Structure formats: C-alpha cells, structure tokens
Design a protein around this ligand. Sequence first.
Ligand SMILES: Cc1cn([C@H]2C[C@H](N=[N+]=[N-])[C@@H](COP(=O)(O)O)O2)c(=O)[nH]c1=O
Ligand SMILES: Cc1cn([C@H]2C[C@H](N=[N+]=[N-])[C@@H](COP(=O)(O)O)O2)c(=O)[nH]c1=O
Lengths: 197, 201
Amino acid sequence: SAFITFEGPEGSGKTTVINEVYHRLVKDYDVIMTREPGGVPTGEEIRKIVLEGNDMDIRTEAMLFAASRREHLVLKVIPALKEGKVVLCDRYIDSSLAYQGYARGIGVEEVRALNEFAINGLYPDLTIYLNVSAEVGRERIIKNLDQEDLKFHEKVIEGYQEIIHNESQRFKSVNADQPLENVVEDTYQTIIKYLEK
Amino acid sequence: FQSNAMSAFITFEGPEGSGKTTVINEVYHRLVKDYDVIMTREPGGVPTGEEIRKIVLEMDIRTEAMLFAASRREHLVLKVIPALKEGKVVLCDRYIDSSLAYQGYARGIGVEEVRALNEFAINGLYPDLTIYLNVSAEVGRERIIKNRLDQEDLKFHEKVIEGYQEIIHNESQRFKSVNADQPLENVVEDTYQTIIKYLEK
Ligand SMILES: Cc1cn([C@H]2C[C@H](N=[N+]=[N-])[C@@H](COP(=O)(O)O)O2)c(=O)[nH]c1=O
Ligand SMILES: Cc1cn([C@H]2C[C@H](N=[N+]=[N-])[C@@H](COP(=O)(O)O)O2)c(=O)[nH]c1=O
C-alpha cells in the first residue's frame, strides 16, 4: 500500500495532474483517487458548512477542515491502505498548514497540533508538491483578478515554501510551471521511483 | 451617574442527575433582579454553531470532539464575548470542562489531548467562575429515574463523575463545588449564594 498526497496553490494544475496520473498507474497498481471529504456523508455535511458560510471565523474553519479530514481518513483512506492499495489523495494536512496556518495567519504550529489530533500521526508516505509560480498560477486561473485574491495566492505559495524547507524529506517538488503534459510525466515518474524501492 | 459595568463569565458543570438545568434557571431568575445577566448554552442559537450541532445529531469520537470544539468557538466569539463586552454576567451551561470529562476522560480520548484541542477553540478564555454540581453517582441515578438505567449508561455515568473529580481537583482559582446531593431547593440556594459572594468583590 501507499498513501500519496498532492499539494499545491491555486493554478498548479493539481486536479488534472492527479486525474491523469491515476489512469497511468492503474495499469501497474491497485490504486484509487480521492479528495476530502470524498463521498463520506458525515465529511460531506461538515465541508458543506465550510462551503456555504462566509467571513467564517478562521479557527472554526480550521477545525471543520480537520473534522472532515478525520472522517475521510478513517472511513475511506485507512480501509484502502489495509487492503494494500495506493491511495492518491488530493489535499491533506499540508493544505491546512498553508491556507489556515500561514496565509490566514492562525499560525502553522497551532494548526499542525489541531491536525495531529485529527490524523493521529498518520502522515502520508509521499507528498507531491506542484510548485507553480504565483505569476504562472495567476495566468492559469484567468485562462480557466481582484487584488485581495492576488495577495492571498502569494501568501499561500509563501506558506508552502516555508513548510517544504523544514520537513523536506517527505516532499517531492515538481515544476508545475511547465505545460501540463510534462507536469504529469514528472509526477508519474516521481511516484514510480518511490513505489519501486 | 453612568455606573461601571461588571462583566463575569460563569459556567456550570456537573454530570446527569445533578439538577444543573433547574439550578441554572432558578439562579438566573434570582440574579436578574440585581444584575444585567444572560443565560446561555452552546451552540446558543449562533448560526454556524447550530449547523454543527445538527451534524452531531442527524461518528468517530475525535470527530465529535472537534465538532463540539468548533461549536464552542462560534458561541464564544459571536455570543459570549460580545455580551461580556457589554457588561453582562454570562451564565453558561457547560463549557470546556464538559469536553474534558466526557470526551477526554469518559470516552477515553485523553484529557490533555482534548484540553489542547479546546484551548485552540477558546484561545485561553477560561471562565471567571465555574460551579460544579457535585452529585454522587447514586443520588444522580435516582434523580434520572425519577424524571432503571441500562448497564452501559450506569457505567458511563460513573466514569463521567470519576473524570470530573479528576478535572476539578486543585482548580480553586475558578472552581467552586456545591453539594448537589441535597434537595434542589438547597442546591439552588447554595449556588446562588456562591455566585453573589463572587460578584460582590
Ligand atoms: C483541504 C483544504 C482545502 N482548503 C481550500 C483550499 C482550496 N483552494 N485552493 N486554491 C479550496 C478548494 O480546493 P481545490 O481548489 O483543491 O478543490 O479548499 C483549505 O483552505 N484547507 C484545507 O485543509
Ligand atoms: C458541551 C458538551 C456537551 N456534552 C454532552 C454531555 C451532555 N449530557 N447529557 N446527558 C449532553 C447535553 O447536555 P445537557 O444534558 O447538559 O443538555 O451533551 C459533551 O459530551 N461535551 C461537551 O462539550
């Protein structure tokens, strides 16, 4: 089995990348693709509170992300891993650390401790970071902007950079400024190498 | 002329059968005569707090603990803090100690893990005074039946009491215990007197 997470800011092509990498690995592995809350009804109900309310207190928001994360983890991810599957997960703890902890300003370590309660130490085996520049991301978002949005997008990237440096061992950064075909090939190759050793 | 407003965050804790509901209500009505007071309980009608609670009604123990903590934060920030800012005595039925006794100790998550989660939700805002309605398991048991219990319930009620006895020990900077084994008339009286002594300083 393998627990592989995918992280990135907006405009990194993460969605398409995970989907195209999934189809390729299917040939060689017993793999599944998922994203929190991933169909789990309880996780869905929690995420819906986050999707609907606005100007929501950022700590509350963080706790709700953590709660939906746990339900997804316990009801979908853990059972998949015990069956011996390769789980490709779109977003996990690093997303809360970068969005809620750094960019929103709650504090990365505070958000990390909340999330450790939710995941009880189950970190991914591998985390692919789709390293896109703020400018390329920006252009990708418009191709598919308000000033506040630009500043937040930059803070998210800045948060991901600081997070990557401290625990560089579990992360594998992929150059996501390249065209998507190449981002997919570099991601697939990174995953293939990890899985074969 | 325009007097100084003296706010206070007072919580009430106790297991089932402690008479807490009647106590907090009767105390409220006696205090309203002399103080600007409000009575609340989480989620307390705050929009998001109520949405979260409906999830805990319509699930893993850690998930439930995080949802109670998130409903607590909403109630604190959108209801309790504003009332304190306006000079009110806030009477609150349950708060962090309930999560420590029930989720932390009784459900077995760990009191310290649940305290840490809750400190993220409350950001260090502990009550000024907390009344613990100290009812013995047996008296509590008889009160619950009045208003038998299956084995699972009886055992859990005992474990919640054990948890509270551990959590309140050496917490006199905010905790005050009232003997909840006496008739309710007296429990209401002792509680009221405890609060007015606290508030008159
Ligand atoms: C999983 C997760 C998502 N989110 C947000 C970030 C995402 N925005 N981006 N850009 C948003 C929806 O994510 P996708 O764009 O990956 O579907 O949810 C968090 O803020 N915290 C979290 O922990
Ligand atoms: C606020 C809170 C309530 N509860 C539970 C205990 C209470 N026991 N009952 N019976 C229940 C509803 O509260 P009342 O019984 O005080 O209405 O919710 C927790 O387990 N953790 C908490 O943080």
